[PDB]
Design a protein around this ligand. Structure first.
Ligand SMILES: [Cl-]
Ligand SMILES: [Cl-]
Ligand SMILES: [Cl-]
Ligand SMILES: [Zn+2]
Ligand SMILES: [Zn+2]
Lengths: 231, 231
C-alpha cells in the first residue's frame, strides 16, 4: 500500500552506488578499465564521438542500460521511440538509437554476442521483488539508476525503460513472454558511440529469483572502457 | 531548438484540445455518450470502480490511451511494467493493467475485436511527422496528451508510452515490425474498469501518412461512455 506520490528520483534503499563513482564526474580515463560491481549501478559521462565498451566479463550478466542528454535528464534513450525508428524490436550493429526527441543519441557499433537483448521489460524495483516473494529490501536496477545519477549530483525526472543488455526474454506466437537464461558468452562486449554528450547509466541487474542472469542465479559484475573520439 | 531542455508538458502546437473539455472537470455524466473529435485528445476523470467504454465508431481508428493516478501524474499506466506482470506483450480481457508501481490501475474487461493492440510504439509527435516528410505543424498524439491534461489544469512530468488501441504493428519472424491496417470493425469497443481514482487521456491518432488508421488514411473520432461504480 502506498501513502505518498511516486518519486522517480528517490531510491527505496541504499547500496554503495549512492556514494561510489567510477571516476570524478563519471569521466573515465583513456586506456583504463572500470567495473560496475555486481548488484550496483554507475554513471559514465561521454563526449560526442567517444565510444563505450561494455563487457560481460563472466558471460551471463544482464546490464540495464540508460542514456541521458548531458544537462537534460528529460531527454533520454527511449525504447518506445527506438522501435518505430528502426522498425525493429531490438538493435543490431550499425543501428542508430534515438532519444525521446527521435534524434540520434547513440550508435550500436559492435556486438560480439548472438545479438539477443531486450527492450520490452521495465527495470526491476522493490515492487518486483516483493511480488516474487522476497522479504525485506532487495537491490534493484531502478534504485541503482537513481543512486548512480545522484552520485553525480543529477536527478532523473522519469525512469525510462532500460535497454536490457544480454537479456533473453523471448516473445512467442500469441504474445506470451518467457524469462530465459542469456545466450552470451564470457567476455562478450557491446560498443556504443555517443552521438551527443551524454550521461550513461549501467546497472548490473541483481535478479537472483529468476534465471535471467544465468541458471545459477548468481549476479556478477560488468567491465567498461571508454575510447576517446578518433583523431 | 534542441538547445532547450525537453519539456514533457509543453505542446509543440495547438488544436481545440487545449481549450475544450468533454464535461466540466472531465467528469462525464454516467451512461451518456461523448465524442473525442478526430485528431484531438480529451481527459476523463474516473472514480475507482467506474468503467469506461471506448468505441471505435467507424472501425479503423487508433486511440492512444493513457491513465494517470488522480492527484499524481508521476504514477501512470506503464507499458514496460504491464508486460512483465502479465508475461504478455499486450493485454486481453480479464487482465489487470499495472502502473509504474506494479499495482493495479485498470482492468481490461471487454474487447469485441480480435484483440490486436500495440504497447510497443511511442505516441506520434512533431518529430515523427517531420521525419515522414510533412511540412509545418501536424496534429499529434503527444501534443494531444499535453493539451488534454492542460485543459484540466494538470501537467504531466513524463510522456508515457501509450496503449495504442486497435493499432496493428506486429513483431514478425526475425524481429522486424510492420505497419498494417487495423483488424477492428465498425463499432468495436473495449471496456476498462478503474482500480484507482484516475485521469484517463485518449487521443484520436491523426496519423494520415501511414495506413494505421485504415488504408484510406482518413482519421476519425472515437466515442466514450462511463458507467457508474457497482454496489
Ligand atoms: Cl524483472
Ligand atoms: Cl507513429
Ligand atoms: Cl526469430
Ligand atoms: Zn534488474
Ligand atoms: Zn498518434
Amino acid at each position: 500500500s502506498f501513502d505518498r506520490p511516486f518519486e522517480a528520483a528517490r531510491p527505496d534503499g541504499e547500496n554503495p552506488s549512492a556514494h561510489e563513482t567510477l571516476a570524478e564526474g563519471g569521466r573515465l580515463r583513456p586506456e583504463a578499465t572500470y567495473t560496475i560491481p555486481a548488484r550496483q549501478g554507475r554513471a559514465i559521462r561521454m563526449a560526442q564521438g567517444e565510444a563505450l565498451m561494455v563487457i560481460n566479463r563472466d558471460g551471463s550478466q544482464i546490464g540495464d542500460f540508460w542514456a541521458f542528454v548531458e544537462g537534460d535528464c528529460g531527454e533520454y534513450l527511449s525504447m518506445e521511440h527506438l522501435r518505430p525508428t528502426l522498425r525493429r524490436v531490438s538493435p543490431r550493429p550499425g543501428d542508430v538509437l534515438v532519444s525521446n526527441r527521435r534524434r540520434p543519441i547513440l550508435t550500436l557499433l559492435e556486438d560480439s554476442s548472438p545479438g539477443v537483448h531486450d527492450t520490452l521489460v521495465a527495470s526491476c524495483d522493490v515492487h518486483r521483488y516483493a511480488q516474487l516473494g522476497h522479504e525485506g529490501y532487495h537491490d534493484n536496477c531502478t534504485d541503482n539508476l537513481r543512486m548512480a545519477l545522484g552520485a553525480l549530483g543529477l536527478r532523473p525526472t522519469t525512469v525510462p525503460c532500460p535497454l536490457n543488455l544480454w537479456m533473453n526474454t523471448p516473445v512467442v506466437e500469441g504474445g506470451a513472454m518467457e524469462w530465459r537464461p542469456p545466450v552470451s558468452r564470457r567476455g562478450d562486449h557491446v560498443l556504443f558511440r555517443a552521438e551527443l554528450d551524454v550521461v550513461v547509466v549501467i546497472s548490473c541487474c541483481p535478479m537472483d529469483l529468476l534465471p535471467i542472469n544465468g541458471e545459477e542465479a548468481q549476479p556478477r559484475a560488468l567491465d567498461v572502457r571508454l575510447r576517446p573520439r578518433p583523431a
